[PDB]
């Protein structure tokens, strides 16, 4: 399957017009991974930093492309994005003000991304771990090394740990390559195709736990593991073939169950204690309201909050507005914090009060934007 990218351009901190800030271009929910993301100043291309390819639960990809600084003095900035799902490159300009609408547990995840031979310019194998959506480990088929993605990961883990997993990943990389070939032979096609794996567990706020192991082919769910019944789910006749093979090995299934239920949860708690400083902190949001003519729409921004769990909506006198509204979703700030936003198109009438409702610590925060 092929899914068009969602794009949002915004600033790390609220622009002071005299104060250099970070321009961000966030591209998410796209597939395949092939992506061209450029930042533009008045139409010209600018030197910008790009994050490692990251993976979501739905098998899509996302990237944060940021610029060194944007003093923002009487200029016009935008973002250019080229993708296989776009004929003409989509351009999104940065405004003083779409998509979104997606909307306190802890989890650990490990992702794999295979790319059918040849390389196609992209690394054929990639593996990255996440805890609470925080990057921790990074491996790829180019540089075959372990590589911690967090400071508190590398500090609390000896060199013998990374040495051991740098060897395992090389083994898993090769096995992944073989399964990718086998699939293409089963689907009776060749050329560019992708192979993805996601495993992990999560620890719920009350002490409950769950775990999952899943596989995707070309962005679509392929094989899904049930650790309770010790059986694999297949949504395709071709996926059914692997199902019958994998289920034939009982020791493997049992092994998966134990890791997800016992081993994984242990790794999660261990990592949480390591990053206790970063993960257990909470920084309140800074709300900002603005308006743009042409009939007019209102904007509400919430800056620099952690964790990402947040709820934000517009109100009218003083009830919530479900009509003519947009949700930015949770966006990476780049500081390790996050920011979002919500907009409303107004038929203003007379004497109506419009105010922004935000709940973070909950801790309900309301800012009155506008009234006739």
């Amino acid at each position, epitope marked *: 399957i092929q899914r068009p990218p969602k794009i949002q351009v915004y600033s790390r901190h609220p622009p002071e017009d005299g104060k250099p800030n970070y321009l961000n271009c966030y591209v998410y929910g796209f597939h395949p991974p092939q992506i061209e993301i450029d930042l533009l100043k008045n139409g010209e291309k600018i030197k910008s930093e790009q994050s490692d390819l990251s993976f979501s639960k739905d098998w899509s990809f996302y990237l944060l492309s940021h610029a060194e600084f944007t003093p923002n003095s009487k200029d016009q900035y935008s973002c250019r994005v080229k993708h296989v799902t776009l004929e003409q490159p989509r351009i999104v300009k940065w405004d003083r003000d779409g998509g979104g609408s997606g909307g306190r547990t802890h989890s650990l995840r490990y992702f794999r991304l295979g790319i059918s031979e040849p390389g196609y310019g992209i690394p054929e194998f990639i593996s990255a771990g996440y805890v609470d959506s925080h990057p921790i480990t990074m491996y790829n088929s180019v540089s*075959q090394l372990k590589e911690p993605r967090a400071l508190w990961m590398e500090e609390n883990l000896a060199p013998d*740990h990374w*040495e*051991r*997993y740098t*060897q*395992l990943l*090389r*083994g*898993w990389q*090769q*096995a992944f390559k073989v399964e990718l070939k086998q699939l293409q032979h089963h689907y009776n096609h060749s050329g560019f195709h992708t192979y993805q794996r996601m495993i992990g567990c999560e620890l719920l706020e009350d002490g409950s736990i769950t775990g999952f192991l899943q596989y995707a082919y070309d962005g679509q769910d392929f094989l899904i593991f049930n650790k309770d019944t010790l059986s694999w789910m297949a949504m395709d006749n071709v996926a059914d073939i692997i199902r019958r093979v994998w289920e034939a090995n009982r*020791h*493997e299934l*049992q*092994y998966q*169950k*134990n*890791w997800l239920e*016992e*081993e994984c949860i*242990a*790794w999660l708690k261990r990592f949480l204690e390591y990053g206790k400083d970063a993960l257990q902190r909470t920084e309140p949001p800074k709300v900002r309201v603005n308006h743009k003519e042409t009939i007019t729409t209102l904007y509400c921004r919430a800056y620099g909050f952690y964790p990402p769990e947040i709820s934000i909506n517009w109100m009218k006198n003083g009830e919530e507005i479900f009509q003519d509204t947009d949700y930015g979703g949770i966006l990476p700030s780049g500081d390790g914090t996050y920011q979002t936003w919500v907009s409303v198109e107004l038929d203003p009438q007379n004497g109506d009060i419009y105010s922004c409702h935000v709940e973070h610590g909950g801790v309900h925060m309301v800012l009155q934007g506008f009234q006739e």
Partner: antibody, heavy 107, light 114 residues
Framework: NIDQPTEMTATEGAIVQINCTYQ??????LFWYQQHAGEAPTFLSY??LDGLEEKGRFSSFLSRSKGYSYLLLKELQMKDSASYLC??????????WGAGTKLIIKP | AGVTQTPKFQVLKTGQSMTLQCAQD?????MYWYRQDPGMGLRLIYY???????DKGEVPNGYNVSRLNKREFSLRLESAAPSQTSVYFC?????????????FGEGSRLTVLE
């Protein structure tokens, strides 16, 4: 660390139980190998979840809470005389081998 | 099929170089080299997850290793020592982690005399 009885003697046709205790960081499984004298070991059983795994005359029990396992040999034949190796996996997938239990079967 | 290992017997004067041959017909990925001694569970000297990569084990000291093909993993000791007298097992598994069923070579009997 992993421990099992050094030597065990039993008569042919009888039943025998070889205990194996292990203390490791994590647990990814526990293996039993049979190794005849002067020969290469052979895979016997693999246990991860708590319970009993029976194959023919052989059965392998595991307790993850107790860190305990036993290989249970029923209806002992002469060919059963061998060394029986016990091994388990760490949190990392490394394998720890116990010095086996030499089983001597008297006719 | 199975893991093939040679030689099965060697006597060496200390200081001599010798290499043990191991080949796997099972199209596996991971390969190991084990040393078995009396009163001790098997120890891993060296292993490889797949072809093109190898890494030291519990007791790498005095040993080297190489993966030629996906089929072959050879154990090399450049300078023989009396402490290296043992029965060397070359083992092969389809993939790491899961060793079982782990396949062992016939075994290689090594005695090093001054």
């Amino acid at each position: 660390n992993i421990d099992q009885p050094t030597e065990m003697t039993a008569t042919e046709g009888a039943i025998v139980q070889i205990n194996c205790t292990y203390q490791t960081s994590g647990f990814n499984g526990l293996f039993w190998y049979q190794q005849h004298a002067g020969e290469a070991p052979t895979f016997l059983s693999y246990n991860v979840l708590d319970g009993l795994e029976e194959k023919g005359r052989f059965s392998s029990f595991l307790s993850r809470s107790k860190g305990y396992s036993y290989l249970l040999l029923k209806e002992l034949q002469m060919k059963d005389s061998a060394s029986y190796l016990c091994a388990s996996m760490d949190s990392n997938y490394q394998l720890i081998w116990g010095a086996g239990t030499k089983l001597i079967i008297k006719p | 099929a199975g893991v093939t290992q040679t030689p099965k017997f060697q006597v060496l004067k200390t200081g001599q170089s010798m290499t043990l041959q191991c080949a796997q017909d099972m199209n596996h990925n991971s390969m190991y080299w084990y040393r078995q001694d009396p009163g001790m569970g098997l120890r891993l000297i060296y292993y490889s997850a797949s072809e093109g990569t190898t890494d030291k084990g519990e007791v790498p000291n005095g040993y080297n290793v190489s993966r030629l093909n996906k089929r072959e993993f050879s154990l090399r000791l450049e300078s023989a020592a009396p402490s290296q007298t043992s029965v060397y097992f070359c083992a092969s598994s389809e993939t790491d982690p899961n060793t079982g069923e782990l396949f062992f070579g016939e075994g290689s009997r090594l005695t090093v005399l001054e």
